């Protein structure tokens, strides 16, 4: 487990365990709380079908080492796009200059401990032939085009990564991970009487491409997703103007969980709260959501896009209850902010690569199910919106304003879903909106494996989830 | 530093030559791009060093073509053996992809074989301690401005230099160097149980083109304090000014709408608008790719194609698409040198200051910040979160937030009333504030 990665990242590059001791020693010459060495190699492929042919394919390789030196609030950081002793020495010697004062040189003995595996170590890039991979795309194109005569264009892509990491630190941490990730994306264009619109579908997770050919509710998953993109395009083609103003909004199960990612998720990342810049700073023990809301960030979920067998600091992923029956319980941490807040690591210390600094980041963020049926929720609204799908969103964690934009939405009139409506951005205040949640469904699901989260220029794979739910008052950015 | 940069330049030039030679026997054509970027990024918290980050990034990308089949590969390792593996990877891929006659190296007659020197390289020997002091000065100037400033997100200073080299199988091999330096601060103010954050910055290719740290701090505080105690508007229709910073982004939506990729796929709401009036008849958008030291100047595009002075919009008329090699071939046209984007847009003001625009509008909304995506490529439908200021009797009354603005870009662009003389000068697209006659504002 550690052995396999250590052979590939250290031994194959002329390094041993004792080299790690020596470089961490170099960091500890200065007065630091902590130092780490982060080793990574990754292999990325993508294939794209458009106009019924395989237009493009790419193979991308990266490898490197990143080295941090930390003293209280302070981080020095340097890295190299190679794994070598010289790269390590150059990086450590630059990073330690964050402080000039000499340290005691005390470091804990390096000691690996077991963690639970959350996803296969089998390389998804090598586990299926190129001909079979491309046949997934060909199948998607054929099903979409057969689904409706108005389908004029289909773009379908397959993307895969295989990633090895090893981290070694001054606090004795020695840990490794082997991280697969695959994604199938489908986009379709429909035309009728000169009017055109588009629709999309897809997903994936931490497993091989075989997942796209397995069963989803009695059909082949890729067929189902091809059909979904066509359905979405046809909904949008018929959509009429959305209404403008404050009204009840019923959010679907799954990816509409973007609500949580924006309204509370980032606001509960420990760096913002340690600095006092988040609206949730100092609010542990307060009512920050309705009493119906329990919100978790969960890095333990087998096979999921957003999961972390270890995070990037070697901390095993955890089930972290952030809000319990409306009450704030705590924050997502990395090692730095945990120490500064007098708290403990939570398994949320994540970095985009060896070339970037880790910080507190989400994994899979969702709301636990309640007692209402989705039908009961819809029937409770005299006039409002039903939004079962979203694109992305955005949040200002200080002023507590957030947005998220619908990708499939409908009017609710007299407790029934009626007319499809055009894409609208919804806006509210995080805490206030969470406090307006009056009904929580019994139908929890997470997204299909599509989440990408940005913070300080760093993109990461995440998950979101929720049941169907009702927000009593939310501002809808329509025109009508 | 210039010895370091010239050494890197020679290494990169050889890496392109090596990749092209390894490809030449087994492909009909090939394109190779390499880059290297080096520098420093520092931050401060309450005027003390927080982060010191030493940056060093390199990359090589190759695309090869055989029987009109394309394959690509990339690596951050530029050793000859890594380059060989990257070349072979791309070749192997092109055995599996389908023949596509619009794919291939850009047309020899459009290539920048002798690329112009646009004077993009103005290096500075800035030590970490010197960088820290600049960041600290900007942050401290912000924090000392007003007692309602109660927290900080820090000062930040960045200074980098870059080397880029491009080559292809038509014989082009050209490279250039560039620099970018920037200084910012971001603070938090409070009033009546409300917290607000904002920032200010300065950016340029030369250190001596930056505003002072003390200017940055003063601008940061001014912006931050102006956000305090916002109101949520009630739902209404009113005129809207896009303040200069967001106005640049309003014109920015045009790029996607006139891109050749969207045009050949029929996925743009401007599909049938070539040669037609889409903007007011006094409005011209000038593109200037060869401005000396320009923030988005480039001597060639990402496919090595020459860049030209063009009036993208002339007297409100859409004069051309933004084409790359592939989309140009799809449409039966020639590349316009837009692979990788646009290259300095300039829109003149029509003579009014910001203050005079407020007087002209009288009553309406000024948007200074937008949130979310909410812009449809195919329909032009527009729905974004907004913050800004409410204006009545020609004067700012209070800040506003937790509202949306919505409309359609086709209508918004056609009916622009005026563009201000208050030009934003730190961006690719540069213009003043823009007055629109009406939008739907959703709120209470
Ligand atoms: Zn995010």
Numbering used by the authors:
A (entry chain A): 2 to 481
B (entry chain B): 7 to 450
Please give sentences taken from the publication describing this entry:
Using a combination of biochemical and crystallographic methods we show that E. coli TldD and TldE interact to form a heterodimeric metalloprotease. TldD/E cleaves the N-terminal leader sequence from the modified MccB17 precursor peptide, to yield mature antibiotic, while it has no effect on the unmodified peptide. Peptide substrates are bound in a sequence-independent manner through β sheet interactions with TldD and are likely cleaved via a thermolysin-type mechanism.
The structure of the purified TldD/E protein complex was solved from a 1.9-Å resolution dataset (WT-PO4) using molecular replacement with templates based on structures that were 23% and 99% identical in sequence to TldD and TldE, respectively, to give two copies of the TldD/E heterodimer in the asymmetric unit. In the TldD/E structure, the TldD HExxxH motif, spanning residues 262–267, is located on the central helix that resides within the β funnel, and with the two histidine residues, His262 and His267, coordinating a metal ion, which we modeled as Zn (because Zn was added to the growth medium); a third ligand is provided by Cys454 from the clamp domain. In our first determined structure of TldD/E, a phosphate anion (derived from the crystallization solution, hence WT-PO4) serves as a fourth ligand to the zinc, which is also held by a bidentate interaction with Glu263. An oxygen atom of this bound phosphate corresponds to the position of the “catalytic” water molecule in thermolysin. The resultant negatively charged tetrahedral intermediate is stabilized through interactions with the zinc; this stage of the reaction is mimicked by the phosphate-bound TldD/E structure. In the absence of adventitiously bound ligands, we expect the fourth zinc coordination site of TldD to be occupied by a water molecule.
